[PDB]
DNA sequence: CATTAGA
DNA sequence: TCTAATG
């Protein structure tokens, strides 16, 4: 946790750099098994070999482990944080819509800069198009303060549209967090389940409604299921107006809420913690419900979840708010 | 780990 | 269809 750090960190960074520059997924994907297992280990690596001792851990990790023991640098390290080529993968990547395989091909064009990518708005697609637009406003994080109002909004129509809808605003935003990234909204209505053969317009309709009142006013996918957008608070009696949001509305088959809703809300610790629990608790959960365990080694029979409560009650644990999801 | 675009 | 990107 911070006696293996530096060492864990650069493993990170060089595999990092394998997956995204290069191709180099093995490589990409050794670094971190290494990244892994060098971080539970509970001792100060001294060197190489104490590593390589280490499962994942080869010859040339150690070789590296040992340099950066060595020397507080890494040279393959500090060459690749000074390349042009690799340092603009980087950042192009850091546009929505916008993954590496398009970085690298940008930059082989010749596209390295948001300023490259503005002149040749055209080779971008629309999601890439709204990337770029909202540049600046999608690293923004977003005010709670804001979360209040946006999710008042969302409620709101979301309610008017049919009074049927069930809507949650998940994530951190749900578990207390001072600040979000996205905002994340869990739909589902009495109408759609597990079986009941879809109602894609259940999720439209309201899309539609968002939009009608300016609230969504992009769309990066709409599908049968997950929208995903951008939408806008009103900018008041104006001299100030609002961040452009990223935003994502997904349906689904009110059988199956609670238990996505738990997981939505996670953190990414209560849930393998509420996870590892349910098991010797006899059961067995994942993001759409839960299973009584069925010794034979496994077994199968979804349990009925009418809230968050339902779940905790099953695994007999306490009831957590979310507020204390935290880990 | 899955849903949507896209070409 | 496969393949990319976000989650
Ligand atoms: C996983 C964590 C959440 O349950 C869900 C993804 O929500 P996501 O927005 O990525 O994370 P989060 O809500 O914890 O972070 P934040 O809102 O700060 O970006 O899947
Ligand atoms: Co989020
Ligand atoms: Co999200
Ligand atoms: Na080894
Ligand atoms: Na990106």
Same mark, same amino acid.
């Given at each position: ?217 992009? *769309?990066? +996918?709409?599908?049968?299921? #997950?929208? &995903?957008?951008?939408?806008? @608070? ?6 100030? !107006? /609002? ?21 939505? *809300?996670? +953190?990414?610790?209560?849930? #393998?913690? &509420?996870?590892?629990?349910? @098991? ?6 994942? !993001? /759409? ?28 644990? #306490? ?9």
């Amino acid at each position: 946790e911070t006696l293996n750090g530096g060492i864990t960190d650069m493993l990170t960074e060089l595999a990092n750099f394998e997956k995204n520059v290069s191709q180099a997924i093995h490589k990409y994907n050794a670094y971190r098994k290494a990244a892994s297992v060098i971080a539970k280990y509970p001792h100060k690596i001294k060197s190489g070999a104490e590593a390589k001792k280490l499962p994942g851990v080869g010859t040339k990790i150690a070789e590296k482990i040992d340099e950066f023991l060595a020397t507080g640098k890494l040279r393959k390290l500090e060459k690749i944080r000074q390349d042009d080529t690799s340092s603009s993968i980087n950042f192009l990547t850091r546009v929505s819509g916008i993954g590496p395989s398009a970085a690298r091909k940008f930059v082989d064009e010749g596209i390295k800069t948001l300023e490259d990518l503005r002149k040749n708005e055209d080779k971008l697609n629309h999601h890439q198009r709204i990337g770029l637009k909202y540049f600046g406003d999608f690293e923004k994080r977003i005010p709670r303060e804001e979360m209040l109002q946006m999710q008042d909004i969302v409620l709101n129509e979301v309610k008017k549209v049919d009074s049927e809808y069930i809507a949650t605003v998940c994530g951190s935003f749900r578990r207390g967090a001072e600040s979000s990234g996205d905002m994340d909204v869990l739909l589902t209505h009495p109408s759609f389940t597990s079986e009941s053969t879809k109602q894609p317009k259940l999720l439209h309709q309201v899309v539609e409604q968002l939009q009608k009142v300016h609230f969504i006013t992009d *769309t990066l +996918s709409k599908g049968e299921t #997950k929208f &995903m957008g951008v939408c806008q @608070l009103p900018s008041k009696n104006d001299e100030k !107006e /609002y961040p452009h949001r990223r935003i994502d509305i997904r349906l689904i088959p009110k059988d199956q809420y609670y238990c996505g809703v738990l997981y939505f *809300t996670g +953190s990414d610790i209560f849930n #393998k913690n &509420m996870r590892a629990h349910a @098991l010797e608790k006899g059961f067995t959960i994942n !993001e /759409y419900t839960i299973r009584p365990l069925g010794v034979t080694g496994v077994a199968g029979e979804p349990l009925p979840v009418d809230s968050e409560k339902d779940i905790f009650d099953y695994i007999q644990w #306490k009831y957590r708010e979310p507020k204390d999801r935290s880990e």
